[PDB]
Design a protein around this ligand. Structure first.
Ligand SMILES: *[C@@H]1O[C@H](CO)[C@@H](O)[C@H](O)[C@H]1NC(C)=O
Ligand SMILES: *[C@@H]1O[C@H](CO)[C@@H](O)[C@H](O)[C@H]1NC(C)=O
Ligand SMILES: *[C@@H]1O[C@H](CO)[C@@H](O)[C@H](O)[C@H]1NC(C)=O
Ligand SMILES: *[C@@H]1O[C@H](CO)[C@@H](O)[C@H](O)[C@H]1NC(C)=O
Ligand SMILES: *[C@@H]1O[C@H](CO)[C@@H](O)[C@H](O)[C@H]1NC(C)=O
Ligand SMILES: *[C@@H]1O[C@H](CO)[C@@H](O)[C@H](O)[C@H]1NC(C)=O
Ligand SMILES: *[C@@H]1O[C@H](CO)[C@@H](O)[C@H](O)[C@H]1NC(C)=O
Ligand SMILES: *[C@@H]1O[C@H](CO)[C@@H](O)[C@H](O)[C@H]1NC(C)=O
Ligand SMILES: OC[C@H]1O[C@@H](O)[C@H](O)[C@@H](O)[C@H]1O
Ligand SMILES: OC[C@H]1O[C@@H](O)[C@H](O)[C@@H](O)[C@H]1O
Ligand SMILES: [Cl-]
Ligand SMILES: [Cl-]
Lengths: 605, 603
């Protein structure tokens, strides 16, 4: 019978009766394709880590109530078995809120169908949904608990609840009760909060062990004293020792020096503390999974994070320096390290425009639109991610430019506006709430509205999306709306129906093919796609949504392309949805193209 | 129907009635694992070549009489269909003698069962063997001719016969006839010789189109004049334009500057000549396949050649330079070129002694030895490659150092000498024909003799191997021999039966694992032997060739990834012949290393 426990007398963990502490690394299985899970986990082991830490994003597994995804890239059970087979332990963080620069901090958007829900509280509607999620997830985690033969040694309840305004201790008690019900009475349950009494006040709970987080700019002594104030006995734990930091579109790429991380890691380890490296590998926010901060600023597609392992899993100087730190305390595994993957510049691939969004509406919205007097939000129209088209008619002639506006700043988050197929420009949450339009009376006014990511931290995580308040034209509220939820993902997988079902330009889908020879042992290889001359959009290869590009803002210019979605002999189909301006009018088809390169550019001006 | 022909009227090839010239690179399918055949061939095509040229080594396919190998790495037909699939035409060179820095110039050693055989002549026993070989090979090549829907556009008869002393024209005429009977009247048949009347004299033949070869050192106008003397009309052809040159153990690694190859290549092509780059990729002489020159000098395991593609298929600066010459004459295919393969340094892998050769004779020689009054050759003992142990007893006492000698220099090619299991040192063909030994009377005298590779060029290609003449001790002829042919390949595959200043020749073995479920492992690597001296190496039973870090220039041996596994451990076996770094109290010195770069040009 296997045991894992906190030893209070000796300020230590006990593993099968023996003293234990962990040196862990954060890896998010939802940000690494499964094809590479073993690769990253093995490099994590060879670095000298004896555990890994991950988050379970609720919204990654229950995109509608009672419809679950636990297979393929969503197979959290297999991921945890893979960690166990490699001799790694696991610190599980199942939320139900994870923060994590992930859409809505992991909470499902369909929770907002109750408009007034208070998230992360004893709101009975929030609790009932949490409870049903825990009834599905936790029984799957139970045989993976250390004491039942699996790798899970500790489990985090909530995530820095001390940072949220609500301070609902009933909430935290309900989670504890439920985690206990499903997992048993022996599993070590813990919390993590900023290393300061003001955060620990509302984050800490009797019965759950109190850990802190802090990075290389914090005084180590103060931070651990802050923890000691809440737990006078038991191990010192930094649950998120920051190896890097998050980005936002339009801001420079965050970095943290190798020497600062190495030195702080040395100091933490020397105190005998358990430590988790956040992030050890960051990876990618594929599709629409990124989050945002308030005041509204979205995080980009890359989650490279400047982590010791790069986005594509490369071994960096930082990796080796940290491995060397760990070597001073433990005997790191022997033998060569699995390498940085080979990267391949497939070169330039021409695209051509297939159809505008407005022309593809039949395929994007095959059940037809929802008619409404005033606009409806993403949530009301039963779409959570991507894009929704809002359509009306001009109730006046606008031969002279008239102001189209959202007086309460409720374009959440960007609208690409057209009037009888003539693009008018953009409305933008917080930046531009008015845009002048022209056209005749009775012209069709289209706003293509993009969810850029639900805020994942702060008070404003109840971030519905779409047109969340009225639009006016010349000060008068525009009524009579036709609203098309866009099934972009299906439509792209069907090549807009073409394959069956077995200054600005109009938002449109541009497609192009490239081939890769068979019988070559080293092809395909990973690559990086770049969009010189494009502006802002979404990109897919063979229907796999790689995420968002926005070279107009940076810092990210390339997107990471893992080799397993690429195919040999059979043509690889690139689909680009360009929202703002495509380099594709002129009589040079060579300009209407993307380029694959062999080094990332995530760190641009 | 398709047509390929020489139009003499027009000084050109005509393919389907249209003017044609080829720009070809040599690739020997026998020197590249089949796992990488498509890689090398598609790199060749992206370089701008419209054809490849290969040699068919007889002995690679007919190791004993009427026992054939045409499968897997030996599948020539497949290799040609592959070239064809990729849109490449083929210049086939089926010998029967191919030269090629390859064991006896491709000729099987079993021809030497007739001691007096005159190789490459109308010796009727040579011709009868050749003829049975042609009757198995050429009916296979027939459907692969251009005219029957395959890739083969021209076929070479013999190889540089003008360089051989025999000058037997009836041999050449027999070859033409038998090539015609099996291939038909339309195939373009041709010969290749050095570009000088003295080489063409005995190489050229009526009804076989005369081509020449030459490298970057030659006057290109004079070279083609020497050909035009022989063929006043038809295409100019340099069948072997040297991109590089061969190596010998113990000599500096050969190189030819990129600018010289590019320069000549442009000049040849500009004349409207057809040309074949020898080698475009060289590859590897795995196992015992390397040849030798006279006076006896063996070529190494690596056949990199300083070719445009390195031993391991890598794209080199030479490669891009020649691609760029070709581009000025022909649009070259679009798209990215397949990359140089990633290389992985597996690092250090410790070995430990398994068995001496002396102590492994039951598994190496399970038939029992051969008693003979005087020494027999490798051929008489029915073994072709590798090693044979010769054993006798000392007749006199050698308390004091007695001379052991092969006075006619008859150790072919190297002997690892032991008396009662005490290594005495080494006898070398052409270099050390005497070694002073000691031991008691009745002591066991052992000589482990190595076939270092049969000479592939010159008069002395009838290279029997073994103790080819007598050995004397204190000038007395040593008699009464117990001779053990050694099944090294089976023994190694079976871990020497254990299934489920000098040292004694001995096998050393160790293991290393590679993780499964890593998309980019295993990778190609280079194995290196710091501290070792001379020997043979197998990984998972596959004989990667010979090592000789004592002599150079080659220090690393190429290991291709497809023979490496992840489902169970990989085994390295070394047969060290001279000195093993495994006596020290430090097991960590008894070890090889895998690195991620080649060292084939050490001084
Ligand atoms: C950190 O804080 C302690 C007191 O808790 C202080 O005494 C120490 O000097 C500080 N260290 C640094 C590096 O500022
Ligand atoms: C819209 O047009 C009016 C002129 O009618 C101008 O005063 C105002 O600056 C414009 N607003 C925007 C957002 O361009
Ligand atoms: C739109 O306009 C009217 C105010 O006249 C209000 O009743 C309604 O709630 C507003 N709708 C939205 C979505 O803001
Ligand atoms: C791209 O590929 C698919 C088949 O894989 C096909 O349906 C589409 O029409 C192609 N276009 C081109 C130019 O190959
Ligand atoms: C080659 O020889 C010819 C005479 O045959 C002479 O005209 C020419 O200069 C030589 N070319 C070179 C490059 O030496
Ligand atoms: C014995 O061997 C030595 C060592 O090389 C050799 O030089 C010498 O000629 C031999 N001595 C006699 C007396 O024959
Ligand atoms: C060795 O010696 C004797 C001559 O004294 C002779 O019968 C025989 O030809 C020789 N054998 C070889 C292999 O040299
Ligand atoms: C496999 O190789 C390892 C080297 O780590 C060695 O210790 C072990 O004895 C080998 N096992 C077998 C079955 O040869
Ligand atoms: O990368 C920044 C991190 O900040 C922490 O406060 C949070 O707990 C993490 O989930 C993540 O948001
Ligand atoms: O690399 C030197 C070459 O010499 C050629 O003349 C011969 O035909 C080839 O087989 C090869 O040996
Ligand atoms: Cl985590
Ligand atoms: Cl050839």
């Amino acid at each position: 019978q296997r045991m894992f426990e906190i030893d209070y007398s000796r300020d230590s963990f006990l593993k099968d009766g023996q003293p234990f502490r962990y040196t862990s690394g954060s890896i998010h299985y939802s940000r690494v394709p499964r094809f590479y899970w073993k690769d990253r986990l093995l490099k994590m082991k060879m670095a000298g880590l004896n555990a890994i830490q991950t988050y379970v994003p609720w919204n990654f597994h229950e995109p509608w109530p009672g419809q679950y995804q636990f297979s393929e890239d969503h197979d959290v059970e297999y991921f945890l078995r893979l960690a166990h087979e490699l001799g790694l332990l696991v610190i599980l963080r199942p939320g139900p809120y994870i923060c994590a620069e992930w859409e809505m901090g992991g909470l499902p958007a369909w929770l907002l169908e109750k408009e007034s829900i208070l998230l992360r509280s004893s709101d009975p509607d929030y609790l009932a949904a949490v409870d049903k999620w825990l009834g599905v997830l936790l029984p799957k985690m139970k045989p993976l608990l250390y004491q039942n033969g699996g790798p899970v040694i500790t489990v985090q309840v909530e995530n820095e609840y001390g940072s949220y305004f609500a301070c609902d201790f009933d909430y935290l008690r309900f989670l504890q009760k439920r985690f206990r019900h499903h997992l048993g009475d022996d599993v070590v349950l813990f919390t993590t909060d900023g290393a300061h009494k003001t955060f620990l006040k509302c984050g800490a709970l009797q019965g759950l062990y109190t850990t802190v987080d802090f990075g290389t700019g914090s005084n180590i002594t103060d931070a651990f004293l802050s923890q000691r104030k809440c737990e006078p006995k038991g191990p010192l734990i930094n649950s998120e020792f920051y190896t890097g930091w998050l980005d936002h579109w339009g801001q420079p790429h965050s970095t943290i020096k190798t020497e600062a991380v190495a030195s702080s890691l040395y100091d933490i380890l020397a105190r005998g503390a358990s430590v988790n490296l956040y992030m050890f590998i960051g990876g990618t926010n594929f599709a629409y999974w990124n989050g945002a901060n308030s005041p509204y600023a979205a995080q980009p597609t890359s989650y490279d994070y400047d982590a010791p392992l790069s986005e594509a899993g490369d071994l960096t100087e930082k990796y080796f320096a940290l491995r060397n730190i760990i070597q001073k305390f433990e005997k790191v595994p022997e033998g060569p390290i699995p390498p940085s993957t080979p990267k391949f510049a497939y070169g330039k691939v021409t695209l051509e425009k297939l159809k505008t969004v407005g022309a593809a509406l039949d395929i994007l919205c095959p059940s037809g639109p929802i008619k409404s007097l005033y606009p409806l939000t993403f949530i009301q129209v039963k779409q959570h991610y991507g894009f929704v088209l809002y359509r009306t008619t001009l109730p006046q002639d606008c031969s002279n430019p008239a102001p189209l506006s959202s007086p309460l700043n409720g374009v959440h988050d960007r609208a690409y506006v057209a009037v009888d197929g003539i693009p008018q420009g953009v409305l933008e949450r917080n930046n531009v709430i008015t845009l002048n339009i022209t056209g005749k009376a009775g012209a069709t006014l289209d706003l293509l509205v993009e969810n850029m990511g639900r805020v994942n931290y702060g008070a404003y995580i109840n971030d519905f999306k779409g047109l969340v308040s009225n639009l006016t034209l010349s000060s008068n509220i525009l009524t009579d709306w036709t609203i098309f939820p866009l099934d972009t993902e299906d439509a792209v997988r069907s090549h807009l129906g073409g394959w069956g079902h077995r200054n600005y330009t109009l938002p449109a889908f541009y497609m192009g093919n490239f081939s890769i020879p068979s019988g070559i042992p080293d092809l395909p290889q990973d690559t990086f796609i770049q969009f010189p001359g494009w502006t802002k959009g979404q990109v897919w290869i063979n229907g796999f949504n790689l995420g968002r590009y926005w070279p107009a803002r940076g810092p990210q210019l390339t997107l990471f392309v893992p080799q397993h979605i690429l195919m040999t002999s059979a043509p690889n189909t690139i689909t680009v949805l360009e929202l703002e301006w495509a380099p594709c009018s002129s009589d040079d088809p060579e300009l209407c193209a993307v380029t694959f390169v062999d080094r990332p550019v995530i760190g641009s001006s």
